[PDB]
Amino acid sequence: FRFVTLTDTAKLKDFLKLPQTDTLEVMSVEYLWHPLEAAVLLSHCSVCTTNTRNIRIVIYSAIFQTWTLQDFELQLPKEAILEFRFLYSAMPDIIMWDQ
Amino acid sequence: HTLCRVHTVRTGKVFKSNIQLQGDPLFYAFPNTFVLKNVCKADISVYLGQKVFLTIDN
Numbered sequence: 001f002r003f004v005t006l007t008d009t010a011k012l013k014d015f016l017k018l019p020q021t022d023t024l025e026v027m028s029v030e031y032l033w034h035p036l037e038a039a040v041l042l043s044h045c046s047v048c049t050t051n052t053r054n055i056r057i058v059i060y061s062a063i064f065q066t067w068t069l070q071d072f073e074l075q076l077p078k079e080a081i082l083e084f085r086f087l088y089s090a091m092p093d094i095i096m097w098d099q
Numbered sequence: 100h101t102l103c104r105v106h107t108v109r110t111g112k113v114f115k116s117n118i119q120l121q122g123d124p125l126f127y128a129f130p131n132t133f134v135l136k137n138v139c140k141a142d143i144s145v146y147l148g149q150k151v152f153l154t155i156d157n
Contacts, residue, residue: 016114017114056113069113069114070113071110071111071113072113073113
């Protein structure tokens, strides 16, 4: 239980080419079935000041030390609390639930 | 519903990427549409019609 910061939302904003000053938060993190990969769930609305929030998934690979954006288009109210599980598959298939 | 079931493929649009088209798009001269498959590599194909699409993927 000695560890170092993996990443932060500022570097994620730089990587995702986001215009900065947007609202980016990490809802959850989960190891997928790949032994050396982990997916981080992000809530973003570009300084929306609106209840709606786009939900995105970014997968971090420790072999390559590389972050990759994923095709995830879901939109939620900001009040939702999201938890997700990865299923038993080679491909990244997930189950989310927002209470 | 009967015969086949529709589903749409759409990727890379997760964020509002804005890449404008360069040049003048090609169009198949004939009214009917056609799909020409590379015989050896099944994945590579060309959709010929109103607009021409050359896909390395299927």
